[PDB]
Amino acid sequence: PIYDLIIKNGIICTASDIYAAEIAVNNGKVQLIAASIDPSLGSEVIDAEGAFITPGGIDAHVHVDEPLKLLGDVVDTMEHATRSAVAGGTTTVVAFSTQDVSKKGPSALAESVKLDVDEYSEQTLYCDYGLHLILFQIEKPSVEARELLDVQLQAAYNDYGVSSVKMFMTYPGLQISDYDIMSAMYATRKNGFTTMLHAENGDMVKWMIEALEEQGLTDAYYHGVSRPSIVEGEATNRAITLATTMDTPILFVHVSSPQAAEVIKQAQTKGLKVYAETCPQYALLSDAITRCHGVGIDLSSISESPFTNPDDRFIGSKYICSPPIRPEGTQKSIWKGMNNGTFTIVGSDHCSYNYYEKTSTASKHRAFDPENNKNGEFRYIPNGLPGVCTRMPLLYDYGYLRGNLTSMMKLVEIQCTNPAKVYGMYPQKGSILPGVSDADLVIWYPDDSKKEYNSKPKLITNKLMEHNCDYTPFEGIEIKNWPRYTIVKGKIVYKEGEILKENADGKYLKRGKSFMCTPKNEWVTEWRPKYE
Amino acid sequence: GTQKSIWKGMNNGTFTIVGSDHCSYNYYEKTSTASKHRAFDPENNKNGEFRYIPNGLPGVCTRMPLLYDYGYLRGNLTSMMKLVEIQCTNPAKVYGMYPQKGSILPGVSDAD
Amino acid sequence: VKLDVDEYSEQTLYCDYGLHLILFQIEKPSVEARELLDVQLQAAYNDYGVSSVKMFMTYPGLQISDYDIMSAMYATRKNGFTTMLHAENGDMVKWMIEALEEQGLTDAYYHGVSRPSIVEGEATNRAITLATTMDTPILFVHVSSPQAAEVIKQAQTKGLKVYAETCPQYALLSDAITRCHGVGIDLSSISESPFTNPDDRFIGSKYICSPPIRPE
Numbered sequence A: 001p002i003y004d005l006i007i008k009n010g011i012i013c014t015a016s017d018i019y020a021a022e023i024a025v026n027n028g029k030v031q032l033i034a035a036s037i038d039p040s041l042g043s044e045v046i047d048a049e050g051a052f053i054t055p056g057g058i059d060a061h062v063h064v065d066e067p068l069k070l071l072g073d074v075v076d077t078m079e080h081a082t083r084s085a086v087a088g089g090t091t092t093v094v095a096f097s098t099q100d101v102s103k104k105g106p107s108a109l110a111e112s113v114k115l116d117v118d119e120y121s122e123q124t125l126y127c128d129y130g131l132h133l134i135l136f137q138i139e140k141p142s143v144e145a146r147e148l149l150d151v152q153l154q155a156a157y158n159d160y161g162v163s164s165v166k167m168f169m170t171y172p173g174l175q176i177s178d179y180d181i182m183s184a185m186y187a188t189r190k191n192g193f194t195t196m197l198h199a200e201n202g203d204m205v206k207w208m209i210e211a212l213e214e215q216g217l218t219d220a221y222y223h224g225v226s227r228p229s230i231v232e233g234e235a236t237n238r239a240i241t242l243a244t245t246m247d248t249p250i251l252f253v254h255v256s257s258p259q260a261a262e263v264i265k266q267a268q269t270k271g272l273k274v275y276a277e278t279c280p281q282y283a284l285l286s287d288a289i290t291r292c293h294g295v296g297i298d299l300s301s302i303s304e305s306p307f308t309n310p311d312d313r314f315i316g317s318k319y320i321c322s323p324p325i326r327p328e329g330t331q332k333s334i335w336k337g338m339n340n341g342t343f344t345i346v347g348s349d350h351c352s353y354n355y356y357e358k359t360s361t362a363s364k365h366r367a368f369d370p371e372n373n374k375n376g377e378f379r380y381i382p383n384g385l386p387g388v389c390t391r392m393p394l395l396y397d398y399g400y401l402r403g404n405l406t407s408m409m410k411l412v413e414i415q416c417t418n419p420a421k422v423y424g425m426y427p428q429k430g431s432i433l434p435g436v437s438d439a440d441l442v443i444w445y446p447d448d449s450k451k452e453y454n455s456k457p458k459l460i461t462n463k464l465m466e467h468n469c470d471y472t473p474f475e476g477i478e479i480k481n482w483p484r485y486t487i488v489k490g491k492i493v494y495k496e497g498e499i500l501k502e503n504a505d506g507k508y509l510k511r512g513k514s515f516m517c518t519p520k521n522e523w524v525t526e527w528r529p530k531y532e
Numbered sequence B: 001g002t003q004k005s006i007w008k009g010m011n012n013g014t015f016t017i018v019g020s021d022h023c024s025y026n027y028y029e030k031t032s033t034a035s036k037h038r039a040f041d042p043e044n045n046k047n048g049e050f051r052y053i054p055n056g057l058p059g060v061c062t063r064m065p066l067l068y069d070y071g072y073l074r075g076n077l078t079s080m081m082k083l084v085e086i087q088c089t090n091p092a093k094v095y096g097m098y099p100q101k102g103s104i105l106p107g108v109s110d111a112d
Numbered sequence C: 001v002k003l004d005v006d007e008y009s010e011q012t013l014y015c016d017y018g019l020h021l022i023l024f025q026i027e028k029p030s031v032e033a034r035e036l037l038d039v040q041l042q043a044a045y046n047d048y049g050v051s052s053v054k055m056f057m058t059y060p061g062l063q064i065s066d067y068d069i070m071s072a073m074y075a076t077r078k079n080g081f082t083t084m085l086h087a088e089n090g091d092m093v094k095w096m097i098e099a100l101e102e103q104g105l106t107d108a109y110y111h112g113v114s115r116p117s118i119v120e121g122e123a124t125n126r127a128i129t130l131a132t133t134m135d136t137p138i139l140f141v142h143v144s145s146p147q148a149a150e151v152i153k154q155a156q157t158k159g160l161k162v163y164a165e166t167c168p169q170y171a172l173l174s175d176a177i178t179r180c181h182g183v184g185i186d187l188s189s190i191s192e193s194p195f196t197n198p199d200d201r202f203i204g205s206k207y208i209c210s211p212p213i214r215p216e
């Protein structure tokens, strides 16, 4: 036959269209869209039975185990994360390369990426992956440093196709001053990079944690109390101000604060290039889940939580992340942000640590280490939730089907297409473009069917995650659709609950410059950077 | 000083669609009932006062090229995709002509 | 405070005077330091009737971190002191001065350029946020930035105890007076300025203050 694969009787969903049509696939790519394709033309034919076909999900906020152990030991390798991704309808992930402070000179940042690429090149990869670069050591003073940093970003792009840089305004060891952020912005704007910020006020967080410990308030729930929404709001406001002074496009990761969303919206209204990301957990969970006792998940339906296991005082740690899962009444704000344009993309902030084994370096119970003066205090709890698998189905269900998102188009926009565009993987990834797109596609189950599908899951379980972690925070909850087929580069890698390892051929992805991150050329004063 | 905030509105999502408000009255003939000079009618107490000027400009032809040029090419719109969204696809969606009109969808779209 | 009182006790004084206390060295970490700082403010009040404390968010040698401001606020709230802040972002000021010097833009006029209104606005917003977390009344000194006045007004509308000071020069002068070339002063009527003495390159310094005299 002329084509490897034909998808028939399905409904195509893109970031701006919904329509019935059929797709032909060959040599790893979308070849053709037409009303009807002769089935004798394909080696393999899939009857979608009226279900939606979406592009594969792109999760640009995934954490995997890496050799510098920035977040300590993490349970998932790139092998495990991409397997989990594919089981949940995600076909590209972007993880993080830790700046290696031991490497010096022009190649120092390229050498940081090399560590990751080399390590993952031996693992079985179920889908493609890219890398962001994390920066926490910036040379001073700014002017004398400019050449080296600029040269270093060029080498990282030229050699490994890295075009994004991530910085933190909180966390000891990661928090960098406003001064250093401006130095970085200088270099990134010049190189058309995508600039990412974690915006929480680190000083406020540090002070308040010490105040709480002084009163003995150390349980997992006080993680949220140590850093309320006003802290994320302040730092987001500060970071916008920096980006404005420096005419540098900026993306805020995992936004959870209404005050942050508010200053973000105001900047977007002004036309400033300010982008934002949020995560399912900020729309679906509230902080009540961190201790025993309508637009989110019914919290009492979650299994293995402080509600069902009130004896286990440490179980709240399953839901500890940064920024914290917010108080009741905040979650609706996050949905509105997804609908009204505040949030450009949705990622998972996938970050996995075991709960049901206590001894290993990748356990949540790592917070118990009597010799290192660690006795379970929230300060020592490894922050993060597994989420790479659940991201797409959670939005399909609680977003589209339950009506918290406006449409399937909006779902595709924020889950697939915008992530590709903002991180320079477009048009190779993110859409369904004949002759252009890698054939990365998801075929769902039909929503309005009376037909029984034995393979369609009713609940989220750990086994369904296909990951290396021993829990998921969404364990036990109803889920009303799931990927029936996940196609990766024209091959079926997930079919009806089964992973097909023999079709796993994922590769490291060299990314381009994002067309969304060219500068506005707008300034606060008459000052201009030398190079202009 | 007002015109810039209209461009920002087109980019930031304030404006869903762009139309012309096409409404045409002659200027170089003065006698017809479809003339701007209809404002001069001494026998009906009309002597050219702004109150009596028929309101409107011709614009149906110039709408698309003006945005292509002053919007996309000159950089006042973010991209060609924003151009299509507000000029083509959103109008179809908001007025119930979608998907017959507004896009390029095989087997579905009128070939417009 | 004693150093100041003792010195002025020998001068001829034409009217009464009081003193604010300026703080730029705060002990760390916060919790262990709390008792001493509290005791010290008590002693300053009991002995000399000082009930106000001033801190800076800019100037090398005076700029203190958000962390240290919270420590101070903890003490001042407890003692019913008046807490005063100079709110400009010191990091943004420092970076921009260096950027201007690198291009050789060093004339008095570039003092304003190094620290536009948005810099005072950011820091004032940051300081309100701290005051809110700490439930501590706060006064902003010499406010000159529209963005600063905006966030101050919003806090006052909420009923937070945020007070503010401004100065005649921020209502009456614009930065045109700092170099060669209205509801305030007709600037051309000022004598001995860059307008009347364009030969004198340094005369703009007569009107250099912090925060800077703002644009028209």
Ligand SMILES: NC(=O)NCCC(=O)O
Pocket (backbone or CB within 6 Å): A063, A071, A320, A321, A322, A323, A349, A351, A383, A384, A385
């Ligand atoms: N914050 C969190 O939930 N996990 C650590 C991953 C990160 O945000 O860098």
Ligand SMILES: NC(=O)NCCC(=O)O
Pocket (backbone or CB within 6 Å): C208, C209, C210, C211
């Ligand atoms: N900034 C200024 O005008 N003078 C120095 C006194 C001060 O503001 O502390």
Ligand SMILES: [Zn+2]
Pocket (backbone or CB within 6 Å): A198, A253, A254, A322, A323
């Ligand atoms: Zn983070």
Ligand SMILES: [Zn+2]
Pocket (backbone or CB within 6 Å): A061, A063, A349
């Ligand atoms: Zn993260």
Ligand SMILES: [Zn+2]
Pocket (backbone or CB within 6 Å): B021
């Ligand atoms: Zn009309």
Ligand SMILES: [Zn+2]
Pocket (backbone or CB within 6 Å): C086, C141, C142, C210, C211
């Ligand atoms: Zn001052």
